[PDB]
Amino acid sequence: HHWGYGKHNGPEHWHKDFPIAKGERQSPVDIDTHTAKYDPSLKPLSVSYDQATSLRILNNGHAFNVEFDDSQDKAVLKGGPLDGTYRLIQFHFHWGSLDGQGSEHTVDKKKYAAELHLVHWNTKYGDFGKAVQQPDGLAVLGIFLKVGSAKPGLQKVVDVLDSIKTKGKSADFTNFDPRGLLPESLDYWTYPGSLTTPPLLECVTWIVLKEPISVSSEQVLKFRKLNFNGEGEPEELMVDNWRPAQPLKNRQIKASFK
């Protein structure tokens, strides 16, 4: 009886195995745009993905992860609210059963159709596993998806999903350029938070871009054909793999922009 997104194992059950679920810096949150304070001390974000080397795409039973070779200092996030340098290890999405929900963060309670997370680990902790034990171990860049025009840079991801339909399937996925998933503007909100799935570790500096990307209805419909279940198990469509907004508690959301 492992965690998931269903009635019996979903977000409102996670605290039993992961008591930090009710902790002081849980994610995601609602971003109240009027209460978020402009911080002129925040730097422009530095997103350096020119040398990013993707290796593989994996259906892990709760999402699909596009994994990167992080053996060298290549694809790095720095600046913005960050001290030091954070290395890209994977990206994944959260999405809905319908276009009207799917994002984890919300903006003045607005839910987007989906949300992209680019996960980076702080190089001062040597690897991904040690970094998640530290309050500044990860930086996750969050990008909202709305349904409209297709995102050409997403189609290579959409087209491989047929080959990883079920939990535990992986496929070679080399030479994928994540620069094709970024909006024009790097304006952002930032706050200290957590992983949004178990083990819900409070190790993340969240950086959430203001500008959504547009994807087509057909692109997000193909996300919704994936399966939570393994091959030869009862088919459970991989939809609504988002955690709802959690209490902000003693936190401030800062804006990079006026």
Ligand X SMILES: C[C@]12CC[C@@H]3c4ccc(OS(N)(=O)=O)cc4CC[C@H]3[C@@H]1CCC2=O
Using CB under 6 A as the binding rule, whether residue 114 contacts ligand X is answered as no
Q: Which residue has the tokens 């319908």?
A: 98
Using CB under 5 A as the binding rule, whether residue 151 contacts Zn ion is answered as no
Residue 132 interacts with which of Zn ion, ligand X, none, CB < 5 to 8 Å by class: ligand X
Q: Which residue has the tokens 């996670």?
A: 14
Using CB under 5 A as the binding rule, whether residue 210 contacts Zn ion is answered as no
Residue 37: exposure state from Cβ atoms within 10 A (0-12, 13-18, ≥19)? exposed
**2 in a labelled binding site:** no
- Binding to Zn ion (CB under 5 A) within 95-124 occurs at 117
- In contact, 213 and 181? CB cutoff 8 Å: yes
Residue 197 interacts with which of ligand X, Zn ion, none, CB < 5 to 8 Å by class: ligand X
Closest contact distance (angstroms) between CB of 63 and Zn ion is 7
34 catalytic residue (yes or no): no
Q: How far apart are CA 20 and CA 74, in angstroms?
A: 33
Closest contact distance (angstroms) between CB of 63 and ligand X is 8
In order of 42, 61, 255, the CA distances from 2 in angstroms are 40, 11, 37
And the tokens for 175? 């030479």
Helices (H), 72-194: 128-131, 155-160
Minimum CB distance to Zn ion smaller for 117 or for 169: 117
Residue 169 interacts with which of ligand X, Zn ion, none, CB < 5 to 8 Å by class: none
Using CB under 6 A as the binding rule, whether residue 238 contacts ligand X is answered as no
Q: Which residue is nearest to Zn ion (CB)?
A: 117
Minimum CB distance to ligand X smaller for 166 or for 196: 196
| Among 207, 48, 188, 198, CA closest to 136 | 207
Using CB under 5 A as the binding rule, whether residue 25 contacts Zn ion is answered as no
Q: Which amino acid is at 3?
A: W
| Residues annotated as catalytic (active site), given as ranges | 62
> In the complex, which residues of this chain contact Zn ion (CB under 5 A)?
117
